[PDB]
């Protein structure tokens, strides 16, 4: 599936990193989210098209996700700074300069973490139900909605089951449901992904108050109303606490703001990367 | 001031009702703030060139302002019942069906009402800056940050004194702050508007949340993040006892969006209106 897209690999200081690009100009980076069989392709093909009329799209896959490396956890920490080294160091490799950042959820967490630590590489900054601010204490206290992914049973139902907590009202397709769970049944992503999220667990997704508002970019931070895994007063607090973010709030709409409303998601980013 | 707009009149059950117009197509209704010498003409000014290329735009003054009557208030009561009705009899004496409606503030609360209790004459609400959730208590404990508007002392430095509240960054024209001024001044309308914010000071400008549920058409919550008369967190509740509410917050910008951030303002409405 998603063989529309040539898949590239580049080298990010020794991690061999997978990622797609279509279009042309300037660059727009996407990042895919943490559920169990995520990766760039499967979380942004609908998007894809549209961004390339404008810009030149690049959608990579996380360290532990994908056809990028999921080295051995035996000897590698999946940290959340693992992740954000990942993403800049592929910034860097691909040669990249002023970036669009678009990351959803543990996506976000990453996005962002790069925003505050090489902030002289991205432009603007786009939150989309971005786990910025997930305390190990929200973990424990929203366990019972957070369970279909964070303890994903590797099973077939259990990836519909991911697929309908993420969601509003949307039915995908058998094919999604098998590309994704064929992706997760792996045994080097299953292992790099109970290590990801056992951490996640335990250390949350989370940046402080003082943090957030240290970004020195444009940002805007996007959630849907109904998301259920990072819940919309979450992101509401991160409007809040940054203080140049545009805020925008779905309704009808769970958290996976860019497959159920795609046209929407692309035209409130385009227009604010000054695109449309 | 304002010329390059025919006034027209028309009669609202007894009320003799001041409205401009322009452009043509589906009928867009704005209505305007409550604050000292305000009506349509100068609160849409800049919007409504944009507004008319798209659709047919109206701006009316509402009881107690502009140049629509303001009944004596030793016989008549300026309540919010009294703005609605009004706005609902506007409305109907065009013959207007399915509009697009936009309040600001007051305007918001009587844009609310409006769709409350005529929903079958609007088919979009956009609330700016509504006071739609502004009870008593809210009037007491934000008072000195309400002053400004709500114990208006008449003068010129006062009106300037507004006008920076209203906004985060704006510098107003000498020859806004006359024109405001000056209609300020007139005996009928400074009986009017002690009436109407005597009145707003101990009833507040409120719906319950049971009531904001109920609306049963698309609405559009904006809001100034640095808006200091109905701030952000009380914007952010409508978004939030509104089930179908699409939410958009604006850094950097006061109460008066759609004069802080005209192109802006208008985008997003046009875009939720169906026309770009
Ligand atoms: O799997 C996806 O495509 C996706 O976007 C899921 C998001 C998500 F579940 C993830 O990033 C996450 C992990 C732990 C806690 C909260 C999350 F929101
Ligand atoms: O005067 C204006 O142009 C305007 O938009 C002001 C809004 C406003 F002050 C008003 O509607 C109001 C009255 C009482 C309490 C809160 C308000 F927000
Ligand atoms: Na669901
Ligand atoms: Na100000």
Same mark, same amino acid.
């Given at each position: ?16 990193? &997978? ?6 100009? *300037? ?9 169990? !069989?995520?990766? !760039?392709?499967? @979380?942004?093909?609908? #998007? ?25 956890? $035996?000897?590698? $920490? ?21 970036? +669009?950042?678009?990351? #959803? /959820? ?5 996005? +962002? ?19 910025? @601010?997930?305390?190990?204490? *929200?973990? %424990? ?5 957070? /369970?279909? %992914? ?17 969601? &509003? ?5 058998? *094919?999604?449901?098998?590309?994704? &769970? ?38 805007? %931070?996007?959630?849907?109303? #109904? ?24 309704? #009808? +709409? ?11 998601? +692309? ?10």
């Amino acid at each position: 599936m998603f063989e529309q897209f040539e898949s590239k690999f580049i080298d990010c200081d020794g991690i061999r990193t &997978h990622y797609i690009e279509m279009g042309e100009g *300037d660059p727009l980076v996407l990042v895919h989210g943490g559920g169990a !069989g995520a990766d !760039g392709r499967s @979380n942004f093909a609908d #998007n894809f098209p549209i961004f390339a009329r404008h810009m030149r799209v690049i959608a990579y896959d996380m360290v532990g996700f994908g056809q990028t490396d999921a080295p051995d956890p $035996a000897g590698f $920490a999946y940290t959340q700074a693992a992740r954000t080294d990942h993403l800049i160091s592929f910034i860097k490799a691909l040669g990249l300069s002023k970036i +669009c950042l678009i990351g #959803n /959820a543990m996506g976000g967490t990453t996005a +962002c973490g790069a925003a505050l630590k090489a902030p002289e590489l991205i432009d603007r900054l786009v939150l989309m139900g971005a786990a910025v @601010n997930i305390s190990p204490d *929200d973990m %424990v206290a929203n366990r019972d909605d957070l /369970a279909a %992914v964070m303890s994903y049973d590797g099973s077939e139902e259990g990836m519909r089951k991911i697929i309908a907590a993420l969601t &509003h009202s949307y039915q995908p397709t058998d *094919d999604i449901v098998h590309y994704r &769970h064929e992706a997760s049944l792996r045994p080097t992503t299953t292992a790099a992904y109970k290590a990801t999220m056992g951490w996640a667990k335990q250390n949350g997704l989370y940046y402080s108050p003082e943090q957030l508002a240290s970004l020195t970019m444009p940002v805007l %931070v996007l959630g849907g109303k #109904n998301d259920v895994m990072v819940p919309v007063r979450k992101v509401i607090d991160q409007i809040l606490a940054i203080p140049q973010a545009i805020g925008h709030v779905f309704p #009808n +709409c769970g958290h996976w703001v860019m497959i159920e409303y795609p046209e929407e998601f +692309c035209t409130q980013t385009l227009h604010f990367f000054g695109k449309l």
